[PDB]
């Protein structure tokens, strides 16, 4: 419970999190409350990586100590935030906003996580698209190699069964032709 909530929740954000660079970016924030929130989020991400290392992340991440806070203080903060919360937008409004985002920006552009709203430069978008294409090509090559190995193993396992099925089908076709010829011969023999 002392660890980060995102660590115990689903959909992990990043296996590798840099506390120092995120804290330096938090110090560059002009708004003081936003800077404090970003620094605390960096500390929470570092504690989540240290306490709950995701698959592929390096181990031995150093944890960060934090002061103890009562649940009553968190409940009071949540009540204050709910009192300060305005009217929630309807689901239709959020759906229309998402549809406008998917109509103005491209669906492939919206799917890519490097397409930010403030990234109007074509060079940065082109570099991000090139990096994403290189990563996708590497992943596709690895998947193709794994699928080729699996297909080779399956073919080596089931080639005899396939050959037996083909031979049985050919024998069945020859038997059907012979049966038709025999039926014709029987009809002719009866007439004769």
């Amino acid at each position: 419970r002392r660890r980060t909530q995102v660590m115990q929740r689903e959909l992990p954000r990043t296996a590798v999190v840099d506390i120092d660079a995120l804290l330096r970016a938090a110090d560059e924030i002009e708004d003081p409350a936003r800077a404090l929130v970003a620094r605390e989020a960096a500390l929470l991400m570092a504690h989540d990586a240290a306490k709950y290392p995701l698959p592929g992340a390096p181990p031995g991440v150093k944890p960060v100590e934090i002061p103890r806070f009562s649940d009553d203080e968190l409940a009071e903060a949540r009540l204050q935030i709910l009192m300060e919360m305005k009217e929630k937008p309807a689901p239709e409004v959020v759906h229309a906003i998402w549809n406008r985002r998917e109509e103005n920006l491209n669906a492939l552009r919206l799917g890519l996580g490097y397409y930010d709203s403030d990234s109007e430069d074509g060079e940065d978008d082109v570099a991000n698209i090139r990096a994403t294409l290189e990563a996708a090509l590497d992943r596709l090559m690895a998947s193709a190699e794994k699928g080729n190995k699996l297909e080779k193993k399956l073919n080596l396992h089931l080639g005899g069964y396939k050959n037996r099925a083909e031979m049985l089908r050919k024998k069945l076709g020859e038997a059907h032709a012979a049966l038709e010829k025999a039926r014709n011969a029987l009809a002719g023999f009866q007439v004769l």
Binding site: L11, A33, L36, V37, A77, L82, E84, M85, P89
Partner: protein, 139 residues
């Protein structure tokens, strides 16, 4: 296919006119002689000479083997793959819509919490300034 009682491909299959369940001729005959002409799993009585109809397979058409490379089999496999992909896309879209609604609610709550945090920081700074002034004046 398969037989209901024997569990294998019936050499001389027959179909009950009441239930439509295929069965082998000899096994169903012995069961009807042993179960007083009553079908298995049903309390209805089936006539061994009337309710049973033989199944005939004319060899006029070319016998297509039931392989996965068959054209109707390929069509059925394509339909099944399309249905599975549609179900997966529907589940993924439902999960994405739920995640987007949760992210929008989290963004609104984060904006409210940032406003509350700024107000609390201003109040704490004012209280610290008042405490410092009281400590300086309180000689």
């Amino acid at each position: 296919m398969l037989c209901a009682l024997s569990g294998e491909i019936p050499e001389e299959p027959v179909v009950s006119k009441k239930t439509g369940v295929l069965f082998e001729k000899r096994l169903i005959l012995k069961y009807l002689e042993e179960h007083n002409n009553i079908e298995p799993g049903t309390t209805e009585e089936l006539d061994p000479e009337t309710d049973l109809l033989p199944i005939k397979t004319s060899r006029v058409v070319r016998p297509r083997p039931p392989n996965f490379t068959s054209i109707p089999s390929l069509l059925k496999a394509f339909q099944d793959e399309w249905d599975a992909l549609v179900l997966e896309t529907y589940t993924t879209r439902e999960q994405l819509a739920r995640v987007r609604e949760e992210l929008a609610t989290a963004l609104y709550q984060h904006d409210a919490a940032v406003r509350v945090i700024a107000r609390l920081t201003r109040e704490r700074d004012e209280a610290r300034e008042a405490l410092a002034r009281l400590t300086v004046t309180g000689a």
